[PDB]
């Protein structure tokens, strides 16, 4: 996704 | 990388989510290496992947290298190309449009007290279907929007929403042996008043209805679980994401035998  | 996380992700089958909320417990985590470290808790709303990843970001961060002090401060971020050549914090580049200056982008927040008074950052992000612009509200008050004109993948809705904590370890331990704190600096098992939480874990579906996903609908990410971790606590009204930790002390001592 976006933040991981 | 030198980033560590305690985050949950909600993956939708297509890019039709029309918004999301996050109510984030505020703390002032300590940094072991303030020259370059940071610690934050945020939401990430995204569409696409790789160089077509678009994000909408908002939360609190302790980042002395950027803000000039160790207080938790409200921040925003975005990217339209997977952080390759676009995007920035706050209003340092053209992108976000602030419409109401009642709340300042970058404002200091009041940190919660361990075992005492708690403070929360309520943020609500909502796509306007007439334009594709994504509007930001703090504690119900409008701030501004990320316009559709800066994006290519998230103009019609988002496919993913993530919530939680992140630290940046400038000392080069991979975030595995730094006492830079995440959340309150205490493990999620300590619970309300001691460990940090994210609540109001809600998204807006294609039709405009608010959905609160059940605990099983999220995928968890905690790559340094002895340092920072997460735990869902289901209340009788809403689901909590407890997250964070004290980080790991550098107490390894291996030698060949
Ligand atoms: C969680 O996210 C939901 C969905 O975005 C938020 O709900 C939205 O909240 C606003 C403010 O209460 C509502 O706006 C109002 O709309 C009415 C018309 O229905 C208008 O007369 C008012 O002046 C105002 O603009 C909006 O309808 C509502 N949307 C939905 C789908 O329920 C909610 O605020 C978020 N919760 C938190 C705590 O962040
Ligand atoms: C996305 O998926 C939902 C649920 O499967 C569906 O209702 C919707 O029509 C799809 N497409 C768009 C553009 O929202
Ligand atoms: Ni060995």
Author numbering:
A (entry chain C): 5 to 8
B (entry chain A): 132 to 380, 401 to 408
From the publication, what sentences describe this entry?
Here, we produce recombinant neprosin and its mutants, and find that full-length neprosin is a zymogen, which is self-activated at gastric pH by the release of an all-β pro-domain via a pH-switch mechanism featuring a lysine plug. Neprosin efficiently degrades both gliadin and the 33-mer in vitro under gastric conditions and is reversibly inactivated at pH > 5.
The final refined model of the derivative complex was used to solve the native pro-neprosin structure by molecular replacement. Moreover, mature neprosin produced two different monoclinic crystal forms, I and II, whose structures were likewise solved by molecular replacement. Crystal form II, in turn, was practically indistinguishable from crystal form I (core RMSD = 0.66 Å) except for the tip of loop Lβ21β22, which was spaced apart by 3.8 Å, and the C-terminal tag, which was reoriented owing to crystal packing. Both crystal forms were monoclinic but with different cell constants, which resulted in variable crystal packing. Even so, the C-terminal tag penetrates the cleft in a similar manner in both crystallographic arrangements but is shifted by three positions, so that H404–H409 from crystal form I overlaps A401–H406 from crystal form II. Indeed, we found a striking pair of glutamate residues (E188 and E297) bridged by a solvent molecule pinching the bound peptides in the product complexes. In crystal form II, a clearly resolved second solvent molecule would replace the scissile carbonyl oxygen of a substrate. Our results suggest that the mature neprosin structures mimic upstream product complexes collectively occupying subsites S6 to S1′, with the two catalytic glutamates plus the bridging solvent molecule poised for reaction.
